[PDB]
Design a protein around this ligand. Sequence first.
Ligand SMILES: [Cl-]
Ligand SMILES: [Cl-]
Ligand SMILES: [Cl-]
Length: 129
Amino acid sequence: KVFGRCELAAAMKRHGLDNYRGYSLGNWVCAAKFESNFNTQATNRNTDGSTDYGILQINSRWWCNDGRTPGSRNLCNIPCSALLSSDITASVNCAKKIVSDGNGMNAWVAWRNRCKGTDVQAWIRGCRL
Ligand SMILES: [Cl-]
Ligand SMILES: [Cl-]
Ligand SMILES: [Cl-]
């Protein structure tokens, strides 16, 4: 599924991501924009052989099982394919664990490089939330 901007913001809010770990909704929408362009089916192979999955590009090196990332963990206790669903529940639940791991949203390098410190409120501008 390719979400609209406000559609995703609403879905994130419905799943308790709004201000989770002190990160406003715009931060989450911005991260999704630059990780996946709001496409739940996005997958990208990393140079090390792990893969990033879904709307928030969650990495099989630590968070989900894809069966082909030797030496990796599955800390969200989920198949990586579950992170590609139209319903964002699994990606949100797993993102909550990631953002709680110590470094906040810096875990998402695209958030750090493209969202951190910017006017992230713009991402929810106009949205009926
Ligand atoms: Cl957009
Ligand atoms: Cl915001
Ligand atoms: Cl594996």
